[PDB]
Amino acid sequence: GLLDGKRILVSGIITDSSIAFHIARVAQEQGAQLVLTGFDRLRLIQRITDRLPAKAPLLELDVQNEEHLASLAGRVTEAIGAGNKLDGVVHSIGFMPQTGMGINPFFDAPYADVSKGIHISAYSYASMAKALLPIMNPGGSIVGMDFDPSRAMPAYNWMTVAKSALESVNRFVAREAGKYGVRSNLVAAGPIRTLAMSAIVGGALGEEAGAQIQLLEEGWDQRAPIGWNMKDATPVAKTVCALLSDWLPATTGDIIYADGGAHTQLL
Amino acid sequence: GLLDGKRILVSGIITDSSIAFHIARVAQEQGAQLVLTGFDRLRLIQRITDRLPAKAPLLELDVQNEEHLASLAGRVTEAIGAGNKLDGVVHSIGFMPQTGMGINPFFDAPYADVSKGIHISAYSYASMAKALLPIMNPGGSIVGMDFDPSRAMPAYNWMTVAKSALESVNRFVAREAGKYGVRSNLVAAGPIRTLAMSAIVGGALGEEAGAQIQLLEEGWDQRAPIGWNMKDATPVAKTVCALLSDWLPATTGDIIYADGGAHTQLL
Amino acid sequence: GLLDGKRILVSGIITDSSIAFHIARVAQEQGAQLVLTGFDRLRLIQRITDRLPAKAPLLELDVQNEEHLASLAGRVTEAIGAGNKLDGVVHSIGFMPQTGMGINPFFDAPYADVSKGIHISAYSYASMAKALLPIMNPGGSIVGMDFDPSRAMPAYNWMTVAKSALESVNRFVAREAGKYGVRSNLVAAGPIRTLAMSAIVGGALGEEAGAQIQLLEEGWDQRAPIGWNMKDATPVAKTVCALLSDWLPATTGDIIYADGGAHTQLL
Amino acid sequence: GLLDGKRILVSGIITDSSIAFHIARVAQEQGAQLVLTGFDRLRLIQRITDRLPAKAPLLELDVQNEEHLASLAGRVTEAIGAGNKLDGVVHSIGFMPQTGMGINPFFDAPYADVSKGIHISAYSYASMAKALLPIMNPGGSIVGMDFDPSRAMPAYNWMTVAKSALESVNRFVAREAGKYGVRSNLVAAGPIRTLAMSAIVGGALGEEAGAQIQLLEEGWDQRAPIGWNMKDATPVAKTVCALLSDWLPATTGDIIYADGGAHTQLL
Ligand SMILES: NC(=O)c1ccc[n+]([C@@H]2O[C@H](COP(=O)([O-])OP(=O)(O)OC[C@H]3O[C@@H](n4cnc5c(N)ncnc54)[C@H](O)[C@@H]3O)[C@@H](O)[C@H]2O)c1
Ligand SMILES: NC(=O)c1ccc[n+]([C@@H]2O[C@H](COP(=O)([O-])OP(=O)(O)OC[C@H]3O[C@@H](n4cnc5c(N)ncnc54)[C@H](O)[C@@H]3O)[C@@H](O)[C@H]2O)c1
Ligand SMILES: NC(=O)c1ccc[n+]([C@@H]2O[C@H](COP(=O)([O-])OP(=O)(O)OC[C@H]3O[C@@H](n4cnc5c(N)ncnc54)[C@H](O)[C@@H]3O)[C@@H](O)[C@H]2O)c1
Ligand SMILES: NC(=O)c1ccc[n+]([C@@H]2O[C@H](COP(=O)([O-])OP(=O)(O)OC[C@H]3O[C@@H](n4cnc5c(N)ncnc54)[C@H](O)[C@@H]3O)[C@@H](O)[C@H]2O)c1
Ligand SMILES: O=C(NCc1cccnc1)NC1CCCCC1
Ligand SMILES: O=C(NCc1cccnc1)NC1CCCCC1
Ligand SMILES: O=C(NCc1cccnc1)NC1CCCCC1
Ligand SMILES: O=C(NCc1cccnc1)NC1CCCCC1
C-alpha cells in the first residue's frame, strides 16, 4: 500500500459525499491506520464511517472550540496508543454562512458571518497544525482542501476570500511544520458534487446563484485537458494520498491542483 | 494637473509619515479636490493635515463602526456639495494586533485578534466600496494599499494573511464597482519607513522581529532593478494617482507594484 | 500633456488598426515628440502615419537585421538632433508563421518557423533595448505589447509560447535598463480587432481557428468587470502612455493589464 | 513498487550526477521497465547506465535531429516488444550556449545561440510528445524538468527564458496529450550540484557568474521550510516518479515544485 504503516488523522466527514470520506477510504485501501474527527452530528458521522473499508476511532472536534483543540493531541494519543505519533493530518473543513455565498449581494455579508467563515475555513488550518504538530513524526504531512481563489467568480463570494486566506495560512503553517520535519500543503480540487453542492445547484442558496454555480462547474470539464468528472472525488482523494506519502518529499507551503488541468487553460 | 477637477476621498492619514499623507499631497499637487477621513485621534489628524498644500474637510471613520459607514455617503455629499460625486476613493487602512505580527509565534495569535485585523485590513475595502459607490461617478476609481503576500515572510505573519484576503476582496469589489463604471485596484508597495515601521525595526514588537524586518526591508533595494528608497513614499503616492487618473482606463480587480520591480527578481 | 517634452520611439505601425498607431496618436495628443520605426512596406507606413496628429520621422527597422539594430541609435540621434536622447521606447512588434498559429496542429509547427516567431516576438524586445538604452535618458521607459500567456488557449499556439518568452525577456531587460535609470515593462492587452485579427476570425488561418478565436475574444467582455470593446485600442494606447509617463516611477520588469480586468475573473 | 509494470522512457542521462540518472534509478527501484535515450556520447551513456539497478535498452536521440524523432516510436516499440506501449516519458533535456548563460552580458547572446537553446530546452518537450504519444497508453504520463523562471535571476539569463517557454509548451502539450488520456507536467526542482553546475560555481562560465550562482543556490536552503540539499537529487527523482504513478490522476499542464518549498517563501 502507498500509505502502509502510516497513522493519519482525517477530519471533515459529514456525509458519504464528503471529500474526506473518499480521502479516508483511499488511505485505508492504501494501508493507513486512521483516526477520524467529526463535528456536531457525531452519531451520524459514526454511522456514515461504518461504511469505511476498516474501523477507525472517531474523536469530536469543533475547530471554533478552544478546549477541543487543547485536548486534541492527548485524545489522539489515547486512540493511537502512547509512544505512537501521527504521520498525516487532513484538514477537509470548510464553512461560510449563506450571507457569504449564494444570491445575497457580496456587500451584504455582515462581518460576524465572514469572520465565522474565515475562522472555520482558514484560521483552523493553523489551529489544527498547532495542536497536532507536537504529536507528528519527522517526514509527516499536513494536507488541506483548497478551491483555486486566484480569480473572482460568481456566487462563491466570501468563501473565495476564505480560500485566499487559507493559501496564505498554509505558507506560514509550512514554516512551523518544517521545524518538526513535517510538510504542509493544499489540494486545490475541481468542483465536487457533494450533497451541499448539489443543493446549491438545485436552488438552495437561490436560483441566480444555482445557475451561476452550474455554469461555473460545467466550465471545468470543457477547460480540463483530461476532463473533469464532478461526481468522482477519487482523483482528489488519490492526490491527497500522494501528499501524505513519501513521494512528494520536497514540496511544502504549496498547492497541488487535482482539477483535470482546468486552471492551466483559458478556453 | 493629472487629477484636475477630480473629487477624491483619502483615508488613512495618522502621521506625516503615512502613505496616505503622501497620496493626499501628490493628488492636491495634481489638482484634486479632496475629502479626508480619519480614525480616533481626529484633533491630531486635523493638525497633521494642516500641512497639506490645501484645505480638505476631515470626516471621522472607524471602519469597524456600522453607523460611520452608513452615514459616510451623506457626510461626504455635505462636504462636497449636493449634486457632486466622488471620482476617487483611497483605502490606506491597515491594522493587526501585536499577537498577529512581531515576535509572538504565528500559532499564538488568538482568533479574536486576527479577526480584528482582517476586518480593518481586508473586509473594510468592501465596506468602504459599499458606502461610497452610490456617490461615485462613472470613470471613477477605488485604490487600496497592499503589501505583496504571494509568499510567506518572517514577522509579518497574520498581516500577510489579511493582505492575501484583501487581494481577494478587491477582485470581488471590482465586480460591484464595474456596475457603476468604476475601477477597483490595489497598489502593492515596497517597504516604507513610516513611524510604526521604524518602531518595529527599533524593537517595538521584539528584537527577533525587528532584525527579521530590517533584513527583509534591505532585500528590496538589492532585488529592485531601479532601486528602492524606503524613506520615500512619493513613488507609491504617484502610482496611486496614476490609478485615480484616466490613464489606466482598462485595469480593474488588479494589483500594480510600486516596489522598484523587486517582486520580478529572485536575486 | 501627459508626455510633454518627451522624445518617444514608436515601433510597430503597419495599418491604421495597429495598436502602435493608437499609441502614437495618444502620445502625440499628450505632447510627445515621436520617431517612428517601420518594417518592409515603408511607403505604406509613411502614407498611414500621414494621418497622425503630427509629423514624425520614419526610420526602417527589421528587428531580424543586425545592421538595422547597430545603425539604429545613430539614425535615431540624427532624427532627434545630437545631444538629445529618447525618454520612451515602444515595442509593438509581433509575428508568427501560420504553422505556429491557426488550424495547423501545435505539433506540426517546424522549429525554423517557431524560431522566426520567437526572434521577432520575444528576442527583439532585448535587441531593441540593447540598441536604444545608450541613447535613453534617466527616468526613461521601454514598453512592450504582451497578450496574457499564463494559460494555454486554442489557436494562439506558438504565439502564446513567444509571449511567455517575452515576459521572461522583459524581467531581464529591466535588470539592464535599470543601470541607465530606465524602466522596462509590458502591457498585456485584451483582444484588439486589428486587420490581421479580423482576417483570422473571418477564416484566414482556417475555420476551426477562426471560430476558436471569435469565442475566445467574446469571453473578454463577459469576464471583464468594466467590459471590453475589442474595436477600441484607445484604453490600451492610454495604458502604454501611463508607463511612458512619470506616474508609474517604481514599476519595472512588470506587466500591466489593459484587459478590462478579465484576467482577474474566472466567470 | 510505485511504478510496478510500467514501461517508462527516460531521456537526459549524461553522467552519474544527471537528474535523469536518479529518476531512472528510483523508477527501477519502484519496478518500472525502462528504455533510455542518450545524446552524442553513447559509449559513455552506456557505461554510466551499467550502474543502474537493472539493464535498460539505450536508444540514440538528438532532439535537433528530425530523423531520430521520426524513427523514435518504431525504435522504442522494437525495444519494448510489438503490442506494448509506454506509460511514461521523461524529458530531462536542457542546453544553452555560454553566450546565453554565465558572465557574457544578456544583450550579447546572439539569436542563433538562444534559438539553439530554446530548441533543445523548450521546443523538444513538444517534439518528444509528438513522437511518443502515438505509442503511449491511456493513463500515461509525460514529465519534464523545469527550473522556476517566474522571476529573473543573475547568470541563468537566456536559460531562464528557455524555461519560461518550456512552461508554456507544457500547457499546450497537455491539450494534445489529453486526447490520448495522457497527462503532461513539469517538475520545477531546486538547484542540483550536477557536474556542469559544479564547474559553473567553480568559475567555468566566469568568476562573476560563479559567485552569483553559488549565492543563488545557497538561498534555497535558507528559504526552504524543510531545507534544500543540492547534493541530493533523490527528492526530485521521487517527485518525477509521483507524476509517472497513478496518484496524481487529475494533474496536467501543471508544475510540481520539488524545491523544499523555497518558492513559497520570500525570506
Ligand atoms: N465540494 C467542492 O466542490 C469542493 C471543491 C474543492 C474543495 N472543496 C473543499 O473541500 C473541503 C471539504 O468540503 P466537502 O466539499 O467535502 O464538504 P463537506 O460538507 O462534506 O465537508 C466540510 C466539513 O466541515 C465540517 N465543519 C464545519 N464546521 C466545522 C467546525 N466548526 N469544526 C469542525 N468541522 C467543521 C463539516 O462537519 C464537514 O464535515 C472544504 O474545505 C471545501 O471548501 C470542496
Ligand atoms: N509601511 C509599509 O511598509 C507599507 C508597505 C506597503 C503597504 N502598506 C499599507 O499601506 C497602508 C497604509 O499604511 P501606512 O504604512 O501608511 O501606515 P499608517 O499607520 O500611517 O496608516 C494606517 C491607517 O489605518 C488607520 N486605521 C486603523 N484602524 C482603523 C479603523 N478601525 N478604522 C479606520 N482607520 C483605521 C490608522 O488611523 C492609520 O491612519 C496599509 O494598508 C499598509 O498595510 C504599508
Ligand atoms: N491584436 C490583438 O488582439 C493584440 C492583443 C494584445 C497584444 N497584441 C500585441 O500587440 C503588438 C502589436 O500587434 P497589433 O495587434 O497592433 O498588430 P500589427 O500587425 O499592427 O503590428 C505588428 C507589427 O510587427 C511588425 N513586424 C513584423 N515583423 C517585423 C520585423 N521582422 N521587424 C520589425 N517589425 C516587424 C509589423 O510591421 C507590424 O507593424 C504585438 O506584439 C501583438 O502580439 C495584440
Ligand atoms: N542542475 C540543476 O540545478 C537543475 C535544477 C532544476 C532543473 N534542472 C533541469 O533538469 C534537466 C536535466 O539537467 P541536469 O541538471 O541533470 O543536467 P545534465 O547535463 O545531466 O542533463 C541534460 C541532458 O541534456 C542532454 N542533451 C543536450 N543536448 C541534447 C540534444 N540536442 N538532444 C538530446 N539530449 C540533449 C544531455 O546529453 C544531458 O543528458 C534540464 O532540463 C535542467 O535544465 C536542473
Ligand atoms: O468550497 C466549496 N465548493 C467549491 C466550489 C466553488 C464554486 C463552484 N463549485 C464548487 N464548498 C464548501 C463550502 C462550505 C461548506 C463545505 C463545502
Ligand atoms: O503593511 C505594513 N507594512 C508592510 C511591510 C511588511 C514587512 C516589512 N516591511 C513592511 N504595515 C502596516 C501594518 C498595520 C498598521 C499599518 C501599517
Ligand atoms: O498577439 C496577437 N493577438 C492576440 C490575441 C490572441 C488570441 C485572441 N485574440 C487576440 N496578434 C499578433 C499576432 C502576430 C502578428 C501581430 C499581431
Ligand atoms: O537548468 C539548469 N540549472 C538550474 C539552475 C539555475 C541557477 C542556479 N542553479 C541551478 N542547468 C542546466 C543548464 C543547461 C544544461 C543542463 C543543465
Side-chain angles (χ1 to χ4, degrees):
Chain A
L2 181 73
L3 300 179
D4 241 276
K6 284 182 188 282
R7 290 177 166 98
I8 300 150
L9 187 144
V10 183
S11 75
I13 301 169
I14 202 42
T15 67
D16 33 89
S17 69
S18 299
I19 292 169
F21 189 92
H22 299 284
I23 297 169
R25 183 184 43 76
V26 176
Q28 282 186 336
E29 280 160 14
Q30 293 311 301
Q33 295 155 263
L34 320 180
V35 168
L36 309 164
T37 73
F39 167 65
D40 196 40
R41 299 164 115 179
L42 277 296
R43 215 186 130 158
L44 161 69
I45 300 160
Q46 192 51 269
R47 191 254 298 172
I48 287 306
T49 68
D50 281 345
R51 275 82 184 161
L52 281 171
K55 226 170 184 185
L58 178 60
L59 300 180
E60 185 190 353
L61 175 78
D62 175 4
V63 297
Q64 281 196 285
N65 196 304
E66 288 298 321
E67 298 175 319
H68 291 183
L69 288 154
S71 59
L72 196 55
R75 288 185 290 137
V76 178
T77 307
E78 193 177 36
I80 57 181
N84 292 311
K85 278 193 170 192
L86 291 172
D87 304 297
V89 169
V90 178
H91 178 284
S92 192
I93 297 166
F95 172 83
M96 188 57 66
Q98 317 193 320
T99 54
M101 299 201 281
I103 53 171
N104 195 57
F106 180 86
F107 285 157
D108 295 354
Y111 192 60
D113 281 356
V114 168
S115 177
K116 194 195 179 179
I118 301 174
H119 192 179
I120 295 147
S121 304
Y123 177 77
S124 78
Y125 190 67
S127 291
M128 282 194 66
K130 188 189 195 180
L132 295 166
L133 274 168
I135 66 147
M136 279 188 83
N137 284 310
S141 182
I142 318 171
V143 185
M145 289 314 303
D146 188 23
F147 190 73
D148 181 18
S150 301
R151 293 172 281 147
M153 56 194 86
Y156 193 58
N157 309 338
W158 293 94
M159 192 48 203
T160 328
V161 183
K163 293 307 203 197
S164 290
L166 175 71
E167 291 195 346
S168 209
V169 170
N170 172 45
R171 287 194 285 271
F172 282 92
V173 168
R175 286 180 87 93
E176 302 304 323
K179 301 172 178 167
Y180 292 85
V182 165
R183 286 161 292 123
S184 169
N185 297 281
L186 303 174
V187 176
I192 293 297
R193 281 293 199 90
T194 56
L195 168 77
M197 284 324 297
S198 268
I200 295 159
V201 183
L205 299 183
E207 179 49 31
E208 295 90 348
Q212 287 167 339
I213 289 187
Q214 198 176 36
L215 260 181
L216 193 63
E217 296 191 337
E218 286 161 7
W220 250 262
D221 180 62
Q222 298 176 336
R223 271 142 50 202
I226 49 160
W228 188 253
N229 177 18
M230 65 182 189
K231 291 174 165 60
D232 193 5
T234 286
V236 178
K238 286 201 194 168
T239 319
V240 177
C241 294
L243 284 159
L244 290 176
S245 91
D246 298 319
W247 295 97
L248 289 172
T251 301
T252 194
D254 227 333
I255 315 147
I256 307 233
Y257 300 79
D259 74 336
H263 80 107
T264 76
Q265 309 292 319
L266 187 38
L267 207 120
Chain B
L2 181 73
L3 300 179
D4 241 276
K6 284 182 188 282
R7 290 177 166 98
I8 300 150
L9 187 144
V10 183
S11 75
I13 301 169
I14 202 42
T15 67
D16 33 89
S17 69
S18 299
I19 292 169
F21 189 92
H22 299 284
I23 297 169
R25 183 184 43 76
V26 176
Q28 282 186 336
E29 280 160 14
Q30 293 311 301
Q33 295 155 263
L34 320 180
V35 168
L36 309 164
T37 73
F39 167 65
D40 196 40
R41 299 164 115 179
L42 277 296
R43 215 186 130 158
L44 161 69
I45 300 160
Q46 192 51 269
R47 191 254 298 172
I48 287 306
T49 68
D50 281 345
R51 275 82 184 161
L52 281 171
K55 226 170 184 185
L58 178 60
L59 300 180
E60 185 190 353
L61 175 78
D62 175 4
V63 297
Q64 281 196 285
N65 196 304
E66 288 298 321
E67 298 175 319
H68 291 183
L69 288 154
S71 59
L72 196 55
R75 288 185 290 137
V76 178
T77 307
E78 193 177 36
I80 57 181
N84 292 311
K85 278 193 170 192
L86 291 172
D87 304 297
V89 169
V90 178
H91 178 284
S92 192
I93 297 166
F95 172 83
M96 188 57 66
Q98 317 193 320
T99 54
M101 299 201 281
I103 53 171
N104 195 57
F106 180 86
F107 285 157
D108 295 354
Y111 192 60
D113 281 356
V114 168
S115 177
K116 194 195 179 179
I118 301 174
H119 192 179
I120 295 147
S121 304
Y123 177 77
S124 78
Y125 190 67
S127 291
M128 282 194 66
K130 188 189 195 180
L132 295 166
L133 274 168
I135 66 147
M136 279 188 83
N137 284 310
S141 182
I142 318 171
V143 185
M145 289 314 303
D146 188 23
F147 190 73
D148 181 18
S150 301
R151 293 172 281 147
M153 56 194 86
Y156 193 58
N157 309 338
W158 293 94
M159 192 48 203
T160 328
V161 183
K163 293 307 203 197
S164 290
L166 175 71
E167 291 195 346
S168 209
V169 170
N170 172 45
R171 287 194 285 271
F172 282 92
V173 168
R175 286 180 87 93
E176 302 304 323
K179 301 172 178 167
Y180 292 85
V182 165
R183 286 161 292 123
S184 169
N185 297 281
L186 303 174
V187 176
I192 293 297
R193 281 293 199 90
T194 56
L195 168 77
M197 284 324 297
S198 268
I200 295 159
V201 183
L205 299 183
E207 179 49 31
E208 295 90 348
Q212 287 167 339
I213 289 187
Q214 198 176 36
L215 260 181
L216 193 63
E217 296 191 337
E218 286 161 7
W220 250 262
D221 180 62
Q222 298 176 336
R223 271 142 50 202
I226 49 160
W228 188 253
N229 177 18
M230 65 182 189
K231 291 174 165 60
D232 193 5
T234 286
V236 178
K238 286 201 194 168
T239 319
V240 177
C241 294
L243 284 159
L244 290 176
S245 91
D246 298 319
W247 295 97
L248 289 172
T251 301
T252 194
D254 227 333
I255 315 147
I256 307 233
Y257 300 79
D259 74 336
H263 81 107
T264 76
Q265 309 292 319
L266 187 38
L267 207 120
Chain C
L2 181 73
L3 300 179
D4 241 276
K6 284 182 188 282
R7 290 177 166 98
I8 300 150
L9 187 144
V10 183
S11 75
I13 301 169
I14 202 42
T15 67
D16 33 89
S17 69
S18 299
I19 292 169
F21 189 92
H22 299 284
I23 297 169
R25 183 184 43 76
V26 176
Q28 282 186 336
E29 280 160 14
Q30 293 311 301
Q33 295 155 263
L34 320 180
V35 168
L36 309 164
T37 73
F39 167 65
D40 196 40
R41 299 164 115 179
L42 277 296
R43 215 186 130 158
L44 161 69
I45 300 160
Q46 192 51 269
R47 191 254 298 172
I48 287 306
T49 68
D50 281 345
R51 275 82 184 161
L52 281 171
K55 226 170 184 185
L58 178 60
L59 300 180
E60 185 190 353
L61 175 78
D62 175 4
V63 297
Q64 281 196 285
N65 196 304
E66 288 298 321
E67 298 175 319
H68 291 183
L69 288 154
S71 59
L72 196 55
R75 288 185 290 137
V76 178
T77 307
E78 193 177 36
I80 57 181
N84 292 311
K85 278 193 170 192
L86 291 172
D87 304 297
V89 169
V90 178
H91 178 284
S92 192
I93 297 166
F95 172 83
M96 188 57 66
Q98 317 193 320
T99 54
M101 299 201 281
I103 53 171
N104 195 57
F106 180 86
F107 285 157
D108 295 354
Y111 192 60
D113 281 356
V114 168
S115 177
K116 194 195 179 179
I118 301 174
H119 192 179
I120 295 147
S121 304
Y123 177 77
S124 78
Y125 190 67
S127 291
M128 282 194 66
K130 188 189 195 180
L132 295 166
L133 274 168
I135 66 147
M136 279 188 83
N137 285 310
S141 182
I142 318 171
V143 185
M145 289 314 303
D146 188 23
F147 190 73
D148 181 18
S150 301
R151 293 172 281 147
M153 56 194 86
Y156 193 58
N157 309 338
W158 293 94
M159 192 48 203
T160 328
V161 183
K163 293 307 203 197
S164 290
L166 175 71
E167 291 195 346
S168 209
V169 170
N170 172 45
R171 287 194 285 271
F172 282 92
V173 168
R175 286 180 87 93
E176 302 304 323
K179 301 172 178 167
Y180 292 85
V182 165
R183 286 161 292 123
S184 169
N185 297 281
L186 303 174
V187 176
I192 293 297
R193 281 293 199 90
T194 56
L195 168 77
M197 284 324 297
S198 268
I200 295 159
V201 183
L205 299 183
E207 179 49 31
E208 295 90 348
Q212 287 167 339
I213 289 187
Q214 198 176 36
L215 260 181
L216 193 63
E217 296 191 337
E218 286 161 7
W220 250 262
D221 180 62
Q222 298 176 336
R223 271 142 50 202
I226 49 160
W228 188 253
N229 177 18
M230 65 182 189
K231 291 174 165 60
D232 193 5
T234 286
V236 178
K238 286 201 194 168
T239 319
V240 177
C241 294
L243 284 159
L244 290 176
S245 91
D246 298 319
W247 295 97
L248 289 172
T251 301
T252 194
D254 227 333
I255 315 147
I256 307 233
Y257 300 79
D259 74 336
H263 80 107
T264 76
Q265 309 292 319
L266 187 38
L267 207 120
Chain D
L2 181 73
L3 300 179
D4 241 276
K6 284 182 188 282
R7 290 177 166 98
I8 300 150
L9 187 144
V10 183
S11 75
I13 301 169
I14 202 42
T15 67
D16 33 89
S17 69
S18 299
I19 292 169
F21 189 92
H22 299 284
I23 297 169
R25 183 184 43 76
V26 176
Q28 282 186 336
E29 280 160 14
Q30 293 311 301
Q33 295 155 263
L34 320 180
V35 168
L36 309 164
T37 73
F39 167 65
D40 196 40
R41 299 164 115 179
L42 277 296
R43 215 186 130 158
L44 161 69
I45 300 160
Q46 192 51 269
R47 191 254 298 172
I48 287 306
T49 68
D50 281 345
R51 275 82 184 161
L52 281 171
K55 226 170 184 185
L58 178 60
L59 300 180
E60 185 190 353
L61 175 78
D62 175 4
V63 297
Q64 281 196 285
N65 196 304
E66 288 298 321
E67 298 175 319
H68 291 183
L69 288 154
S71 59
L72 196 55
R75 288 185 290 137
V76 178
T77 307
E78 193 177 36
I80 57 181
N84 292 311
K85 278 193 170 192
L86 291 172
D87 304 297
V89 169
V90 178
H91 178 284
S92 192
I93 297 166
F95 172 83
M96 188 57 66
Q98 317 193 320
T99 54
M101 299 201 281
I103 53 171
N104 195 57
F106 180 86
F107 285 157
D108 295 354
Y111 192 60
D113 281 356
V114 168
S115 177
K116 194 195 179 179
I118 301 174
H119 192 179
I120 295 147
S121 304
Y123 177 77
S124 78
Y125 190 67
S127 291
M128 282 194 66
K130 188 189 195 180
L132 295 166
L133 274 168
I135 66 147
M136 279 188 83
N137 284 310
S141 182
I142 318 171
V143 185
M145 289 314 303
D146 188 23
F147 190 73
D148 181 18
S150 301
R151 293 172 281 147
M153 56 194 86
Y156 193 58
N157 309 338
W158 293 94
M159 192 48 203
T160 328
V161 183
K163 293 307 203 197
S164 290
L166 175 71
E167 291 195 346
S168 209
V169 170
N170 172 45
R171 287 194 285 271
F172 282 92
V173 168
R175 286 180 87 93
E176 302 304 323
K179 301 172 178 167
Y180 292 85
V182 165
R183 286 161 292 123
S184 169
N185 297 281
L186 303 174
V187 176
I192 293 297
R193 281 293 199 90
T194 56
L195 168 77
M197 284 324 297
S198 268
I200 295 159
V201 183
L205 299 183
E207 179 49 31
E208 295 90 348
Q212 287 167 339
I213 289 187
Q214 198 176 36
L215 260 181
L216 193 63
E217 296 191 337
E218 286 161 7
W220 250 262
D221 180 62
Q222 298 176 336
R223 271 142 50 202
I226 49 160
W228 188 253
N229 177 18
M230 65 182 189
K231 291 174 165 60
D232 193 5
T234 286
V236 178
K238 286 201 194 168
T239 319
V240 177
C241 294
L243 284 159
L244 290 176
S245 91
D246 298 319
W247 295 97
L248 289 172
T251 301
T252 194
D254 227 333
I255 315 147
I256 307 233
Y257 300 79
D259 74 336
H263 81 107
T264 76
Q265 309 292 319
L266 187 38
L267 207 120

